Amino acid sequence: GPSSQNVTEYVVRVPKNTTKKYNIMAFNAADKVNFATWNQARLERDLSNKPEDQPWLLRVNGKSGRKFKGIKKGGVTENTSYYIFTQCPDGAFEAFPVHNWYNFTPLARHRTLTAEEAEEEWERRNKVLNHFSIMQQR
Amino acid sequence: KRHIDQLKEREYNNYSWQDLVASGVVEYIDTLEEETVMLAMTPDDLQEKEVAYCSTYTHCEIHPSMILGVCASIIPFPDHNQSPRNTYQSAMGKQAMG
Amino acid sequence: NAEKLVLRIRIMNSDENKMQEEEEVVDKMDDDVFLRCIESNMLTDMTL
Amino acid sequence: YDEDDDEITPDLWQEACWIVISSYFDEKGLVRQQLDSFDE
Amino acid sequence: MEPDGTYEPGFVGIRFCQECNNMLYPKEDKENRILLYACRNCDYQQEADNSCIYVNKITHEVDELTQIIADVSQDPTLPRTEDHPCQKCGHKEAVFFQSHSARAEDAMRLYYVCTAPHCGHRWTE
Ligand SMILES: [Zn+2]
Ligand SMILES: [Zn+2]
């Protein structure tokens, strides 16, 4: 096959400017997210920190259809820059700089265990024997 | 042996100990490195294969006397003498007038 | 004389009131944990 | 001499290390380390 | 049923919850008379693959023959043997040793690892 026979050559350019900053959006493979299920998404900087440093908040398929939090990596160009390489209709390659690395992770929906009303106290009494009933009493 | 002649050349011209360090025929060694190295007692005997229980030696001592301190270095053949007497000498050497 | 000495134990659930008789939303004792409490106690406490 | 092929003195003499030893003290010295802590 | 069999059931140390990667916990289905496994933080639950859910008192096996990559063989301070045939490769230079650990091994018996490329085998004689 061509993965074992084809031989090609393409030109590479590195434009000194772009119309938009380029970042990486990383997902855990273990989740195997079907991007087709993403009818829409919202993407906003996280509000716990109340900008460029702000973690991202991703809301897919509505406010609670799907939600992830993205946390910035420590470094991205501390020793080596990261580039995005894209194929163009002319076959030539175009390279784009990676501005930042954000780590995206999945987020459980509504559940809410306060752990402050009496649960901090209840733990002192805990014999490891019950856990469900407090969740109903709320 | 030619490197020794270089050391001899140093008395007049130059051939620094650092160059000997730069020569990399000798290296400076901590105890952590010692745990992994196969240290040799002497160049002569250990290079022998006739009775080579091991020949995986990696490094060798310059001279066993290098273990010794300022005081111990003074008394000859300390090993023919009882060991504490040397410590007493090491203290008493310090006690000597001079 | 067996292939190995094993001893298998059970709790004596005496048929009657030992069956959620008076609720007492406390869970008097879960089984799984109780096998461990006995075993914790079995090894550590008993001097044969 | 140096032909960069063989050691012409496999019996590199024990005393030569003293030439090596004097060269240690000639460069390094003795209490040099105490200065080094202070100097850095 | 005979004093010649063995007990290697292949115990299942853990299974993560697909909803949270947390550990699943045993439980009975007294209604269906079947063992089940559940996560606590979520409603995720799944049947059990075996009746055995616990094991105790350990270490009566040959640990030292395990947990030992043959890469030790690159250490020159570890003695080669003149004893040939890597239980695999028809070549000597087997590396040998005791257990050399905690049980430090009242077993002063030599254990052999060939250092010859293409085997990596750890045995003893
Ligand atoms: Zn779960
Ligand atoms: Zn082998």
Side-chain angles (χ1 to χ4, degrees), chain D residues 4-22:
Chain D
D4 194 71
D5 187 23
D6 196 11
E7 175 70 22
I8 61 174
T9 319
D11 188 15
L12 179 58
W13 194 239
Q14 283 55 28
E15 303 291 335
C17 88
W18 295 95
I19 309 303
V20 178
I21 296 167
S22 290

Side-chain angles (χ1 to χ4, degrees), chain E residues 86-89 91-92 114-121 123:
Chain E
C86 160
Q87 62 174 0
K88 190 201 180 176
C89 62
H91 183 271
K92 51 174 184 82
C114 193
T115 195
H118 182 205
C119 68
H121 277 85
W123 78 114

Side-chain angles (χ1 to χ4, degrees), chain B residues 26-46:
Chain B
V26 286
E27 64 180 340
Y28 249 153
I29 296 295
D30 101 287
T31 54
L32 295 172
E33 279 201 50
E34 207 177 349
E35 192 176 351
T36 67
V37 300
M38 187 61 184
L39 186 56
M41 178 68 70
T42 177
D44 194 24
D45 191 294
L46 284 186

Side-chain angles (χ1 to χ4, degrees), chain E residues 16-24 38-44:
Chain E
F16 295 140
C17 177
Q18 70 171 15
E19 187 272 350
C20 50
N21 294 333
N22 299 128
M23 176 157 62
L24 297 179
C39 195
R40 289 183 180 173
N41 59 50
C42 57
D43 57 343
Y44 177 78

Side-chain angles (χ1 to χ4, degrees), chain E residues 2 4 12 19 26-27 36 38 43 58 62 85 87-88 97 101 118 121:
Chain E
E2 74 272 2
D4 191 52
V12 185
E19 187 272 350
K27 89 168 129 76
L36 301 177
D43 57 343
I58 31 207
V62 188
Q87 62 174 0
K88 190 201 180 176
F97 44 84
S101 40
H118 182 205
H121 277 85

